[PDB]
C-alpha cells in the first residue's frame, strides 16, 4: 500500500451552514428531550454491544 | 505502507458555520434535557460495551 | 511505514464559526440540563465499558 | 455583497496527475524551444498591451 | 462586503502530482531553451505593457 | 468589509509532489537554457512596463 499526493477522509463532516434570521422559538419540556440546535458527529470507530453511538434527542425509560 | 505528500483525515469535523440574527428563545425545562446550541464531536476510537458515545440531548431514566 | 511531507489528522475539530447577533434567551431549568452553547470535543481513544464519551446535555436518573 | 460559508476560486489549477513509467526521451534543439514537462499557470489579472501571458514553448524571432 | 466562515482562492495552484519511474532522458541544446520539468506559477496581479508574465521555455531573438 | 473565521489565499502554490525514481538524465547545453527541475512562483503584485515576471527556461538575445 502507498499513497502519493492523496487524500483520505474516513468519517468527517464539513461545510454545514445554517442561517437563521428573525426567529421566535418557545419550548416547554417535561421529562422528555427537546433538540433544536445543529449537531455534527464524526467518529472513525465505535465498537461495543448495546452501544448507543451518536444519540441526539434521546429518551430511554428502560 | 508509505504516504508521500498525502493527507489523512480519520474522524474530523470542520467548516461549521451558524449565523443567527434577531432571535428570541424561551425554554422551560423540568427533568428533561433541552439542547439548543451547536455541537461538534470528533472521535477516532470509542470502544466498550453499553457505551454511549457522543450523546446530545439525552435523558436516561433506567 | 513512512510519511514524507504528509499530514495526519486523527480526531480533530476545526473551523467552527458561530455568529449570533441581537439575541434574547431566557431559560428556566429544574432538575434537567439545558445546553445552549457551542461545544467541540476531540478525542483519539476512549476505551471502557459503560463509558459515556462526550456527553452534552445529559440527564441520568438511574 | 456578503458570502456565508462560501468558496470562491477565481483562477486556479488543481488535481494535475501525470504518471510516466519506463520512458525514453531524446531531444536535440537548435535555436527553437522544446517543452516536454508539465506546466500549470494560475493568474488572476494580467493587463497590458502586447503582453504575452503564460507562454509555453515560445519562439519569437521578431 | 463581509465574509463569514468563507474561503477565497484568487490565483492558486495546488495538488500537482507527477510520478516518473524508470526514465532515460537525453537533451542537447544549442541556443534554444529546453524545458523538461514541472512548473507552477501563481500570480494575483501582473500589470505592464509588453510584459511577459510566466514564460516557460522561451526564446526571444528580437 | 469584515471577515469572520475566514481564509483568503491570493496568489499561492501548495501541494506540489514530484516522485522520481530510477532516473538517468544527461544534458549538454551551449548558449541556451535547460530547465529540468520543479519550480513554484507565488507573487501577489508584479507591476512594470516590459517586466518579465516568473520566467523559467528563458533565452533573450535582444
Swiss-Prot record, chains A, B, C, D, E, F:
It is found in: Cytoplasm; Membrane; Nucleus; Synapse. It comes from the Eukaryota. Sequence repeats lie at residues 6-20, 21-31. GO terms for cellular component: actin cytoskeleton; axon; axon terminus; cell cortex; cytoplasm; cytosol; extracellular region; extracellular space. Changing residue 10 to K: In PARK1 and DLB; significant increase in binding to negatively charged phospholipid liposomes; increases oligomerization. Residues 1-31 are annotated as: 4 X 11 AA tandem repeats of [EGS]-K-T-K-[EQ]-[GQ]-V-X(4). Disulfide bonds: none annotated. Keywords: Acetylation, Alzheimer disease, Amyloid, Cell projection, Copper, Cytoplasm, Disease variant, Membrane, Metal-binding, Neurodegeneration, Nucleus, Parkinson disease, Parkinsonism, Phosphoprotein, Repeat, Secreted, Synapse, Ubl conjugation. GO terms for molecular function: actin binding; alpha-tubulin binding; beta-tubulin binding; calcium ion binding; copper ion binding; cuprous ion binding; cysteine-type endopeptidase inhibitor activity; dynein complex binding. Highly expressed in presynaptic terminals in the central nervous system. Expressed principally in brain. Cu cation binds at residue 14. The modification Phosphoserine is found at residue 51. Phosphorylated, predominantly on serine residues. Phosphorylation by CK1 appears to occur on residues distinct from the residue phosphorylated by other kinases. One of its GO terms (biological process) is positive regulation of receptor recycling. It is linked to Genetic alterations of SNCA resulting in aberrant polymerization into fibrils, are associated with several neurodegenerative diseases (synucleinopathies). SNCA fibrillar aggregates represent the major non A-beta component of Alzheimer disease amyloid plaque, and a major component of Lewy body inclusions. They are also found within Lewy body (LB)-like intraneuronal inclusions, glial inclusions and axonal spheroids in neurodegeneration with brain iron accumulation type 1. The 'non A-beta component of Alzheimer disease amyloid plaque' domain (NAC domain) is involved in fibrils formation. The middle hydrophobic region forms the core of the filaments. The C-terminus may regulate aggregation and determine the diameter of the filaments. Neuronal protein that plays several roles in synaptic activity such as regulation of synaptic vesicle trafficking and subsequent neurotransmitter release. Participates as a monomer in synaptic vesicle exocytosis by enhancing vesicle priming, fusion and dilation of exocytotic fusion pores. Mechanistically, acts by increasing local Ca(2+) release from microdomains which is essential for the enhancement of ATP-induced exocytosis. Soluble monomer. Homotetramer. A dynamic intracellular population of tetramers and monomers coexists normally and the tetramer plays an essential role in maintaining homeostasis. Interacts with UCHL1. Interacts with phospholipase D and histones. Interacts (via N-terminus) with synphilin-1/SNCAIP; this interaction promotes formation of SNCA inclusions in the cytoplasm. Interacts with CALM1. Interacts with STXBP1; this interaction controls SNCA self-replicating aggregation. Interacts with SNARE components VAMP2 and SNAP25; these interactions allows SNARE complex assembly and integrity. Belongs to the synuclein family. This is Alpha-synuclein. The chain holds residues 37 to 98 of 140 of the full protein.
